[PDB]
Nucleic acid binder design. Sequence first.
DNA 1: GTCGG
DNA 2: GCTGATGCGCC
DNA 3: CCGACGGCGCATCAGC
Length: 324
Amino acid sequence: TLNGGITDMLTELANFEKNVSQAIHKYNAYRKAASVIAKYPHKIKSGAEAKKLPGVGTKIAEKIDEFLATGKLRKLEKIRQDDTSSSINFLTRVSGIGPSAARKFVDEGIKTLEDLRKNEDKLNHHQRIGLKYFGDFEKRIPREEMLQMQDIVLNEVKKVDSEYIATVCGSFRRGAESSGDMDVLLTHPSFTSESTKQPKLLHQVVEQLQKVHFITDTLSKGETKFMGVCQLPSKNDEKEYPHRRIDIRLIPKDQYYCGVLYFTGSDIFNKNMRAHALEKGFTINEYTIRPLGVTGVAGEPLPVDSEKDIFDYIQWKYREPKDR
DNA sequence: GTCGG
DNA sequence: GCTGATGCGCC
DNA sequence: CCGACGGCGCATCAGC
Ligand code: NA
Ligand code: NA
């Protein structure tokens, strides 16, 4: 693509700041910069040129000046041939292994997957599973596979109880041809913000989906949220399917559509809707849409029956998931 | 690191 | 055994 | 010149 050399350099740096430096805000900055530049419709020929783009500053422009001049960045070279740093990056690719655990591991000489398998006694549950499915988790999910995944979930949840209301979100709902994980939202008439009845609502669904061997592993579970692994059924003539990440999320009925809206992405679209709404006199978040008082003071959550209503409130014309 | 009060 | 801090992954 | 930049659910460990 365009300025892919630059956008790579920046992402490489972002990851360095998160994993090795533990400097999360520099990480976000570098990302921001990589994403703008990736959107830019010309080949950048100077640092100064880039700078005009919001999120690019003194330091990144100068690093852009150097890459273009020399084809490479001297700081990055240095880092790629630092054993501690590269090893620490690598480890964090395992789900369950963040910068903290990565650093500790490498301090006691554990640097590779091999070293990890050798030491499964030193990993919690999550990490063990991440280890188990390392490659399968880096694979993308073509849209076809998703559809089969959906129907099963939808069916299985129907079987449990006919009043459950599952929606699948993420890229998939927007129509993207491949998606990273599977986010599922869940709700039921018996569950509202006020009417918090007995749980096991989420449990019995998880239970069911284990029972038809669609779910194969649990990374975390609780009253409202589940994270695990799942696998499409083996066609048997052919090669068994790769294991995927699944999240299921139980949300009160009075907050579903705000949940759906939020979790259907993207980062940018929400930030823009939240910013538009902000000045039109409403604050919306994961859970509710609330009007602001004359004084700039949130009143009460407005009722919501659909994604549409949230667009009504701010008089913004509807934008189907397709176009967000 | 970049931005904005 | 408890409660609160922190790590981790997530629009 | 200097703080904000996302806030949350669950698992785990530190401190008592
Ligand atoms: Na700029
Ligand atoms: Na990780």
